[model samples]
Target: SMNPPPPETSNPNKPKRQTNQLQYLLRVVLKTLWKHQFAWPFQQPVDAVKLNLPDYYKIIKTPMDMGTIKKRLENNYYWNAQECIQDFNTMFTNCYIYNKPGDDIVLMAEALEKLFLQKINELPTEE
Candidate 1:
């Protein structure tokens, strides 16, 4: 028979690390965007170059490039969940150049649902 290991041998007094709410929210947002086929605004910097002088083009600063945006998607530090949500709103509003109508709307509804459920769970309830 397999034996169970002893529990609580190390640093029992140490405080647990706080979960990274912002990073978790970012990952969720990225997943939603990917599902909606708007993961990245452009395949490469040159692709953006052709859209010359469009308001959306100004969203991603020149020389920032696709790699930079990809990195941000992979990791970022936002002060709160609302800040991250706002960032997604701006990106989808401007940089999303694809012609798929209602796609973003559906994705956003799902994202909001996730946030709403999370907030609900965080509230204190009478036992």
Candidate 2:
């Protein structure tokens, strides 16, 4: 009851690609920055503009991994409350600027809590 296009059996010269869908998608992430739709805040990107560190962090938005950093601090160094605040100021002030809605900040928070608990457990128990 249904009539469909005949299969390509007679033709020797066939289309090189099955479809250009994947090629088109790859171009978006690699070649194009989607700058039209989403305006990236990096006024001067290091990778994009080939700028140095002083030029880089001043404008660029590199997502920070604070949980790993805090874990390293807790395991290796003992910082007072004020010192912790100072460290956090250095971090949150520069980074987390690019943290969009629906981003997984809670995962990092939970991980930091777990790491702190582990560090506490490692200390000798007091009677």
Candidate 3:
């Protein structure tokens, strides 16, 4: 018979801080984006088969979606604001790359992209 050792307990680390200005800002921006009709197309992951986008995965390796980013934020997975925003950047980049200028989804994606970037500039910067 094999005997198993008792668990001493897992790793322990302290010092989790409360939400700051950046966290509040991120929540606000994300909420605004989620509520907009422009965000509808990108809210969920691509249904390659149902949508009949067979080549979608072939072209886009890492698929980014609003749901994932929102959950990541809600879970406090971001180390910093830039890290959070990078996912947003990749999200938009994927949409732009996978879509043609004449595509209707492109119109929605472009509008949201411009709005997102414009809000990026609107973010607070300290001296």
Candidate 4:
């Protein structure tokens, strides 16, 4: 007869982190991006899997991922940030007249970054 290993013990004192769908989505997307790190052969310090609390609070907490747009606004450009963000969304998400070209994942990533920045600016203090 084969011997079985002892049962594992659970840690009750340590608090579990609050995770959400955005966490999973971002992790997967970032991991894919990281796979290209070796291709560049120069890009280091890229920790894509880390969950930045502020990033999550600003980018994923908003309605329909609008936080990215809010965070991208700059000085004197805040007024037009929303328009730029909507254009970005439409362009990448198949809502615009000009469809996003294939194999343009970098451009899509840029759009996501811009949108994330937009949301950071408009995110409420309560969160």
Best-matching candidate per TM-score: 3
- Return the TM-score for each candidate structure: 0.38, 0.25, 0.77, 0.23
- Candidate 2 C-alpha lDDT tens digits along 1-127: 1222221222324323221322322233112322322222321122323322344344534322234233323343322333333433334434344344345543343333344344333332222
Global CA lDDT of candidate 4, please? 0.31
Candidate 2 steric clashes: 0
- Ten residues in sequence with the least summed lDDT for candidate 1: 1-10
Q: What's the C-alpha lDDT at position 35 in model 4?
A: 46
Off by over 4 Å in 1: 1-20, 38-47, 52-70, 73-75, 95-127
Over the stretch 43-90, how does candidate 3's per-residue lDDT look in tens digits?
A: 777777768787888888777778777766665666567766887888
In candidate 3, how many Å is residue 35 off? 1.4
Residue 41: error of model 3 in Å? 0.8
Candidate 4 C-alpha lDDT tens digits along 75-114: 1222322344453353234312222444354455465555
Per-candidate Cα lDDT values, in order, are 0.39, 0.32, 0.69, 0.31
Winner by TM-score between candidate 2 and candidate 1 = 1
Instruction: Please list the residue runs of candidate 3 whose C-alpha ends up more than 4 Å from where it truly belongs after superposition.
Output: 1-22, 125-127
- Model 4: how far residue 120 lies from native, Å: 1.6
Per candidate, the number of residue pairs that clash is: 0, 0, 0, 16
